[PDB]
Amino acid sequence: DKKSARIRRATRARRKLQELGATRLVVHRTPRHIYAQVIAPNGSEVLVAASTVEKAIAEQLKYTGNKDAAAAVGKAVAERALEKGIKDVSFDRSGFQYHGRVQALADAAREAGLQF
Amino acid sequence: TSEAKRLGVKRFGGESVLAGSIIVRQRGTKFHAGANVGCGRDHTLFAKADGKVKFEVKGPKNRKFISIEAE
Amino acid sequence: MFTINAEVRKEQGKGASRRLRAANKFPAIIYGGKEAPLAIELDHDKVMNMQAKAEFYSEVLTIVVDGKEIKVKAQDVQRHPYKPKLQHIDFVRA
Amino acid sequence: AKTIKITQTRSAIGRLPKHKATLLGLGLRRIGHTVEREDTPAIRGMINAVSFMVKVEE
RNA sequence: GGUUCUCCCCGAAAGCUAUUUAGGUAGCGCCUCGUGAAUUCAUCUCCGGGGGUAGAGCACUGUUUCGGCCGAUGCAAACUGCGAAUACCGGAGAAUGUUAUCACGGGAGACACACGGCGGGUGCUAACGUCCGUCGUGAAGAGGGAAACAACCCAGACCGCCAGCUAAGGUCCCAAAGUCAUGGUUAAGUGGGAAACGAUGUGGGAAGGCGUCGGCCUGCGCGGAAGAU
RNA sequence: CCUCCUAAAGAGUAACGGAGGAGCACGAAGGUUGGCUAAUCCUGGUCGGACAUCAGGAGGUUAGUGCAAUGGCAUAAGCCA
RNA sequence: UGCCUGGCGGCCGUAGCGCGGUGGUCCCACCUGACCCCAUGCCGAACUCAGAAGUGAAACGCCGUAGCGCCGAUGGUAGUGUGGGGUCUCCCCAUGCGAGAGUAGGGAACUGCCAGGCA
């Protein structure tokens, strides 16, 4: 049991962030591809979603999944959020570890000038 | 070879309770806090903002949540 | 085959049921299919007389009310704990 | 809607406080007193509350 | 123990929380007068609630029994995989109610209540025995009925009438009103004393018997069934 | 002073009513992050057969959560760093 | 706008349990070694680094199987507020509210948004 354990572990913060009702940035990390979504407090709509699979940002990337790809996804999400007006969404690690690609993506997102 | 304690729901559904009001002071957790509802150390559900009180069943385990909606 | 005479129900409730039982009558219900169920009234004496035959449990019942043929089968019957009387029957249209 | 006559038949001495309040709401004071009341579900329920001592001209 | 003139309006309680307390001390509840204030409060209709009682069920905690602890069947105050009516809280609504609601102030009274209906505990599931939660009457309610008989039934007396209708209860005389009618039961003065058992007493009813002889059920009578000038 | 009933599904509501326990303890058994989270049972083990330990499974909160007892408790209110 | 796959919510057994079949186009999954970021209360056990080198083993998506489980009528039944009656320990009458279980029936779920492959 890997996916079930991951979902169960993430559910802690997933429910914790709901009490305060703030927009949340979640990241789904896979070796083949990486995705980053901004979810409104309602939980049924995503303000902005970025994926490594699409060729908009994968043209300059040798492979869809790597540290450089994570940084590119983070910067794309950050710039899109800046031009959309997210107003300092909170962050969630989706039950992952904040030491590798997750940390790289978070640092890339914060580089643009975000305050999360 | 004592003195009874007061339990049960103090504020039911539809009451426009005030912030900090004790909706239910129960033994443990008969109902779980939802939106705009806290949980004290003694497992007491207290309102966080003015509004109407509602009870709703949600979750795979079918557990009742006490929630507060706009007045 | 067999001819059954019944009456159309007009009142629904425990009071109506008690009236039927006290007036040598008893209600019954016929359902089965996408159509709405029909509540009918049958006299107790005739049903008691007809229950004696062993073919009752093996024959499809025919009901004629207001000149309409209904082909039903006995789905369930209700029997008093100690009084040999019939009070209600649920039937399924076949 | 159509109105009805409600008349008090029996006394309300030994009746419960709920029945006394129901009679007060209907508007019946003495035995044999008759009042005119519009027919509504609330009035019908009020009548059924104390039906044992009120006569209704349906 | 006593507390002296009259009239009018409203009109209780004998309950709950503390005592080296049990006859008393504090607060609330009950009564009255004044002031101020919200369709305030009450009945009823609809709506949103937590129920876990009746009913049901053994899935949860348990019990007896059955085939030889395994499975099944019944059952329960410290049993519910379900689940009423009723009660409680809140929202909306027509109608009625002399604001009947709430807050403050002046004045209190009372602090051994009794009986009955409804559902339980207790008691030998013998007692017109005992305690509880709710309601009613008396207490503080006159009048009619049960012969009298506070606790029962009907019904709440502002005064006067040699007027009418009716509730409970009655219509042979005492004593107002049916020796009224219809279809039955009783032979015992049962009515007008009482349950268990027993019985060739009777009408009626559904089922028996190979013209036949009998069984089962309901109604009313008999000893137990016995109150002292 | 607390743990369920009689107590008639709001609270409350009886008779040395039916019932025991605390009158402690942890100064860590407190707070925070990451991860993990059975009990029970079948089967293999030198004995181990279930019962002195471990790993392949059925099963998902029946274990536990300091206490006599109680509810709720796997996003465990547990259990490793 | 149709089929398929992942992520984020509502719904919490009409979403579940058992059985047969199908999925490598994309996606998802199995994994090599880790002396490198990271680590085991021992184990690269879990997370992290480079994919098609092979595959769909197991999990997961979908179709059928109504076998189990779930929901679920109408009706009846038990119960009960109110007033009354009886042979008053208990039952009945007029009225209002109404069980559980089972039967008919359903279902092998549905719905909102984003992303990707094939059309």
Hey, which residues does A51 pair with through a beta bridge?
Answer: A35
Q: Which domain range does residue D25 map to?
A: 1-58
Shortest-distance nucleotide from B62 CA to C1': G12
Nucleotides of E under 7 A from a protein CB: 18, 42-51, 87-91, 93-97, 135-137, 153-156, 167
> Domain total for chain A?
1
Chains linked to B by 3 or more Cβ pairs within 8 Å: none
Q: How far is the CA of D38 from the C1' of E143 (A)?
A: 37
Pairing of strands C25-31, C86-93: parallel
Residues whose CB falls within 8 Å of the CB of residue D30, separated by 6 or more in sequence, listed in order: D8
- The domain made up of B15-70 has a fold known as OB fold (Dihydrolipoamide Acetyltransferase, E2P) (2.40.50)
Shortest-distance nucleotide from B27 CA to C1': F71
Q: Which domain range does residue A65 map to?
A: 1-116
Q: How far is the CA of A58 from the C1' of G49 (A)?
A: 20
Q: Distance between CA atoms of D57 and D42, rounded to whole angstroms?
A: 17
DSSP for B33-57?
A: E-SSB---TT-EEEB-SSEEEEEEE
Q: How far is the CA of A34 from the C1' of G32 (A)?
A: 23
Q: Which domain range does residue C20 map to?
A: 1-94
Q: Which residue is nearest to nucleotide G12 (CA to C1')?
A: B60
Find the distance separating the first CA and the last CA of chain C, reported in whole Å. Answer: 14
Q: Which residue is nearest to nucleotide E154 (CA to C1')?
A: D11
Shortest-distance nucleotide from B10 CA to C1': E89
Shortest-distance nucleotide from D18 CA to C1': E43
> Domain total for chain D?
1
Q: Which residue has the tokens 């779980």?
A: B32
